[PDB]
Amino acid sequence: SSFSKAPQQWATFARVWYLLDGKMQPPGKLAAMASVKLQGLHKPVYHQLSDCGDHVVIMNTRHIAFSGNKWEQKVYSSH
Amino acid sequence: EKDIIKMLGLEKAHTPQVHKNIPSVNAKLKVVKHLIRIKPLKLPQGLPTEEDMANTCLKSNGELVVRWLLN
Amino acid sequence: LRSRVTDRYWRVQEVLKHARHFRGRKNRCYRLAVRAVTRAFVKCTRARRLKKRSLRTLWINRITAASQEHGLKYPAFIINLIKCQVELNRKVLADLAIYEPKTFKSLAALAKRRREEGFAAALGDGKEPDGIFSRVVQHR
Amino acid sequence: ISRKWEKKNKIVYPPQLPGEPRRPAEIYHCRRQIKYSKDKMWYLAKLIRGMSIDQALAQLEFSDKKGAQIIKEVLLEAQDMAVRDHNVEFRSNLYVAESTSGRGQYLKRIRYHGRGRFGIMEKVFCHYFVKLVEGPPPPREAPKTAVAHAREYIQELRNRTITHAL
Amino acid sequence: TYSSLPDDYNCKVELALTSDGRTIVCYHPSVDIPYEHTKPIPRPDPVHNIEETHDLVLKTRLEEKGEHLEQGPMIEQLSKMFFTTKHRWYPRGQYHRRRRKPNPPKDR
Amino acid sequence: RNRIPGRQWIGKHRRPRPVSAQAKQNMIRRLETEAENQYWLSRPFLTAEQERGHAAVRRAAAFQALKAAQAARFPAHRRLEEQLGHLLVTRKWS
Amino acid sequence: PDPVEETRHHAEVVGQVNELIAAGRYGRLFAVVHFAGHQWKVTAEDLILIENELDVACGERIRLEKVLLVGADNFTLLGKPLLGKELVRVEATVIEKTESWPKINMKFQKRKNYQRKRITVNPQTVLRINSIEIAPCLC
Amino acid sequence: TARGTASRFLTSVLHNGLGRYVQQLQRLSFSLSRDAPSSRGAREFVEREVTDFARRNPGVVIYVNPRPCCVPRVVAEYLNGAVREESIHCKSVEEIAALVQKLADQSGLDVIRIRKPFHTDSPSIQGQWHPFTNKPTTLGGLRPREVQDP
Amino acid sequence: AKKGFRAAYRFQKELERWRLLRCPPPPVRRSEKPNWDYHAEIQAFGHRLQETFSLDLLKTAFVNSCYIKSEEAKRQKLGIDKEAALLNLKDNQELSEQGISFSQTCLTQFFEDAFPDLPTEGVTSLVDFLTSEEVVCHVARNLAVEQLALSAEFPVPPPVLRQTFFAVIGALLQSSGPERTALFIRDFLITQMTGKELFEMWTITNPMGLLVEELKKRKISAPESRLTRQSGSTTALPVYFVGLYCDRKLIAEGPGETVLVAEEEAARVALRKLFGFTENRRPWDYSKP
Amino acid sequence: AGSQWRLQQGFAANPSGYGPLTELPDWSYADGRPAPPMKGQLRRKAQRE
Ligand SMILES: [K+]
Ligand SMILES: [Mg+2]
Ligand SMILES: [Mg+2]
Ligand SMILES: [Mg+2]
Ligand SMILES: [Mg+2]
Ligand SMILES: [Mg+2]
């Protein structure tokens, strides 16, 4: 790209913000793509030791649509 | 079953070995027929002669090509 | 004739020179060092076997990441590239993904075109002549 | 036994050429076989590191430790050597560059408990080492500011390279 | 104009096959961002913030006010600034500091 | 909360581990291969009578070669060069 | 697309690339070469470490013909699975014929008194790739 | 182990082999004995192979210093300044020739772990990947939920 | 007291190692070390580089005026007459001037022929960098030119070492043809720019100003900067892509931390493309002419 | 992977099996004289014979 050494490294390891709507979307399918973006498993420069990672903004999370009867069967427990 | 494998020359896996089709060999193969893969030997160019011994190659589909990568 | 070991200084130095970077009393005491040094070498060989596996796993993640960027999954990108008789291992494909964004698009474009030809043959009667990219060239 | 601290005062440096920076003085002094313990003496030694000699004596003047008087005698007699044996003027222009405590030779005794049992008692002796350097005390380092942390973190994110790249 | 992938982001890939059949060629030139797809440079964003005159009778003052918050409030300020946690902003002991390599190998 | 009594793979009560769809396909792939195995063994080229001693000279010669090689086991020759070559230890530059 | 038009279009692209390569309008070249059982992504003025000893004297110039891939900024040529020797020529120069650092291989089993320690010194060869050339002959 | 010893990248000294190849070995010095039985391998090598070795490699200077010693040694110096000590104590003639030939082919850099089996300068031909190299541009560069100015 | 001598002597090998670590010895010349024969090294120097040198020329090139002055002080100290031989020793002052003048002329010819678009200021920076202090001293030290140089105060001062290296060029110029010395310059001085990029050797401070001037020569009105891509404007790590459009056509694009930094990088890419000094450029030819 | 496709087309399951990528010599001298044969190739031509 004929960039200088400093701006070339900065551009490659840049942080990117994503927007993900949640209007009538199951949280599991919402989390599957959100997990990939957070880890950085979409960049071909990925590596666990590196700090590669992208912000994700999820809106309309009150309108998620659980499939089947999971609204009454699935339980979240803590002590 | 171990001895029959040993006495048929099948010690190393995934290495083709040629045997006759006489009943004596077939008697031993029937015992270990669940441990081996058997395919016929095809000869598109016939049996190799003494001139083309070093150019023989055995393809995966089960045919012996006498002249392999000429020139 | 009373025989005594005199080079015992070098006997323990051959062991402690591999344990200079340890934490605690393992870098000074000989009894605790040998058990640490011996376990250090065992982990060296086992990790060396896993070094090839880990790097192969890393390459597939990079290939999958660079293939999803073009809208093509990893399983579809590999089998439909082999059908074009392109024998590139996963090591160089990862390198092409990072340092050759244009070329990796062509390989991804090649795989998608080959895949779309395979589906057309199945959808038809199966008597369709092999696709312009699906023709097999045998060297002999 | 080992006695190397005493011999550090016999080192003679070559004469300095004109124009070179003035070499600050260095005075090495120690006391051997003090009845005070090794660990107890350490806290006093840690106290006076990096302070000028005048305020170092002031702090040890009112300390209630038995070793406070012992250390104050060492500093006072080391100051006299600096101004007389060495050509160090301004006897108030010295700072304690290094102070530490070592262990001496212990005497073993028998301590009785009862039921015919006993325990070995170790009479404790310790050494004190002090080095005085001519000049004002060095300035103590302040904690890293908010900008310093941000500069290091941004620099760290800029050193990153593609691991197992080509 | 046939392409398995769209020609809008990286390059305009054009595949082809040699008449002999032993080689696959592809002409893949770059695609440049058009002028209509870019926004004007926000040049005067801190126009008054960068250069503010306190008064026209006295010279301007470069008084960078500082609070020097304690270690507590400082870390939570940086963590929120860089979108990280607070556990990595604390220093480490002498053991870890000393064992770092003074001259790490450098490639390229 | 729910435990498997004793060891989880031995005894009267075991783990309820079921068979998977992948396992069924592995069995079928092996069955198809073995189905072809027992077809190629069905029709021999020669019958039992026609193979009576067809290759016995080679078998006899193979055994005779084994006897000959095993009967040659004997200590190797000892020569003067081996004994006189030890004096070269103290070779000097005069 | 119709194969009748597809072949006609393919002729134009091959001719266009052949015109581009014949006029010397290509910049830097990279190539994927198969050598010593491994595939290397190689461009001009690089180094590659070969893990096996070669019977080549130091300073000799050797030629590699197992070129899987070649390409530049504006074009890329694929092989099926190899490119012909008359299309791309790659030459490399041997620099160093050395030995690897001592690698340790140890096997240990608990409470059976079995330890085996051996050190492996693998001979190595360092190659310098000088030039990659593309012939303008392309059907 | 790798964590115990140092590491270096694959580097050629003075960009050797690019324009021309220069034999990095500079000199050798043999310290053998005329009476010690352990120096027999060194003495046989000097009489036979040293003269022929110098002809093949005119870029090295060979020093032979027969003096009373118990462990024969050969010292090899390279252009970059690295000096490598070796012992030829009680070795056959062909072993000395193999050992000396190996020292002639080495570049002289320190023999430690090499992190990568390749080295390259400017590997980013036709560009290097950045998160904007494959994302299409929106008309006017608008953000996903940005309201147009007019 | 354990009987024996191997243990006692082997530790003396360790005691020497500790002393060197505690008190490192000052560097000394290779001449004072036991293995040295000056005439043998000179002959091997010519064969190592595959060049034919004149022995009289080389020994004239490896003697510096500093060494001659140092020797004369020793002669006066001892009061022994050697003016007939010592004073009649030609230094390398004349040879170095011939080498430096030819090297700058030869390097300029290479860059003007290979890079027609480089301005007069740019090419002057390129040749000065390759003949600078740090580049030449590194090459001379790794080529055993410093080991054979007769001078006082080892290690040889960088100004003195650069003088000696170009003296060897002067000796090669009079021994072989000028075209033969040109190959020597190409093999050991042009190769020092491999990997390095323009504006790392030709430092300028106003890329935008210089770009407009170059476009006036090329008859292009003026570049216009537009923000192509951006990611995060309130974060502490923003990323901007400033692109330059002339007549609504993209010619360069550069990233950066801020818009001002990115915009200058856009001009850097534009200048690199205009001057034919990109990173995709044809690699320097090293084949036999 | 795709070994089943390669077996269908007649090639080896493993791309290292008797293919043109393995039999051919990987290096040769610049002037053009042939390189010495590989140790592996000579061994592979002895078991085939
Ligand atoms: K059970
Ligand atoms: Mg009592
Ligand atoms: Mg006790
Ligand atoms: Mg006690
Ligand atoms: Mg249990
Ligand atoms: Mg069960």
UniProtKB/TrEMBL annotation, chain A:
Q: What is its main location?
A: mitochondrion
Q: Which domain of life is it from?
A: Eukaryota
Q: Which UniProt keywords apply?
A: Mitochondrion, Ribonucleoprotein, Ribosomal protein
- An example molecular function term from Gene Ontology annotations: structural constituent of ribosome
Q: Where in the cell is it found?
A: Mitochondrion
A cellular component term from Gene Ontology for this protein is: mitochondrial large ribosomal subunit
**Any one GO biological process:** translation
The reply on keyword Calcium is no
**Protein family according to the UniProt entry:** Belongs to the universal ribosomal protein uL13 family.
Which protein is depicted?
Answer: Large ribosomal subunit protein uL13m
First-to-last residue of the parent protein present: 21 to 99 of 197
TrEMBL record, chain B:
GO BP terms in the entry: translation
GO MF assignments: structural constituent of ribosome
Q: Which GO terms describe its cellular component?
A: large ribosomal subunit; mitochondrial inner membrane
Please list the residue ranges annotated as the Large ribosomal subunit protein uL30-like ferredoxin-like fold domain: 1-36
Keyword Ribosomal protein belongs to the record: yes
Keywords assigned by UniProt, alphabetized: Mitochondrion, Ribonucleoprotein, Ribosomal protein, Transit peptide
Primary subcellular site in the record, as a coarse category: mitochondrion
Q: Where in the cell is it found?
A: Mitochondrion
Per the record, the similarity remark reads:
Belongs to the universal ribosomal protein uL30 family.
What is the designated name of this protein? Large ribosomal subunit protein uL30m
Give the species this sequence originates from.
Answer: Sus scrofa (Pig)
Please state which portion of the whole protein this structure contains, as first and last residue out of the total length: 82 to 152 of 161
UniProtKB/TrEMBL annotation, chain I:
Q: Which Gene Ontology cellular component annotation is one that this UniProt entry carries?
A: mitochondrial large ribosomal subunit
Compartments, record wording: Mitochondrion
Q: Which domain of life is it from?
A: Eukaryota
InterPro entries under this entry? dsRBD_dom (IPR014720), Ribosomal_mL44_DSRM_metazoa (IPR044444), RM44_endonuclase (IPR055189), RNase_III_sf (IPR036389)
Q: Which UniProt keywords apply?
A: Endonuclease, Hydrolase, Mitochondrion, Nuclease, Ribonucleoprotein, Ribosomal protein, RNA-binding, Transit peptide
Q: A single GO molecular function, which one?
A: ribonuclease III activity
**Key word Electron transport present:** no
Keyword Flavoprotein among UniProt keywords: no
Q: Which residues form the DRBM domain?
A: 206-276
Annotated GO biological processes are:
mitochondrial translational elongation; RNA processing
Q: Which family does it belong to?
A: Belongs to the ribonuclease III family. Mitochondrion-specific ribosomal protein mL44 subfamily.
Role description: Component of the 39S subunit of mitochondrial ribosome. May have a function in the assembly/stability of nascent mitochondrial polypeptides exiting the ribosome.
Name of the protein in its database record: Large ribosomal subunit protein mL44
Q: Which organism is it from?
A: Sus scrofa (Pig)
Q: What is the lineage of its organism?
A: Eukaryota, Metazoa, Chordata, Craniata, Vertebrata
Q: Which gene encodes it?
A: MRPL44
From TrEMBL, chain J:
Q: Which residues form a coiled coil?
A: none
| Entry annotated with the keyword Transport | no
Question: Where found?
Answer: Mitochondrion
Keywords assigned: Mitochondrion, Ribonucleoprotein, Ribosomal protein, Transit peptide
Q: Which GO terms describe its cellular component?
A: mitochondrial large ribosomal subunit; nucleoplasm
User: Does the record bear Glycoprotein in its keywords?
Assistant: no
Could you tell me one molecular function GO term of this UniProt entry?
Answer: structural constituent of ribosome
Query: Which GO annotations describe the biological process of this protein?
Result: mitochondrial translation; translation
Per the similarity annotation, which family is this? Answer: Belongs to the mitochondrion-specific ribosomal protein mL52 family.
Q: What is this protein called?
A: Large ribosomal subunit protein mL52
| The species this protein was found in | Sus scrofa (Pig)
- Section of the entire sequence shown: 59 to 107 of 160
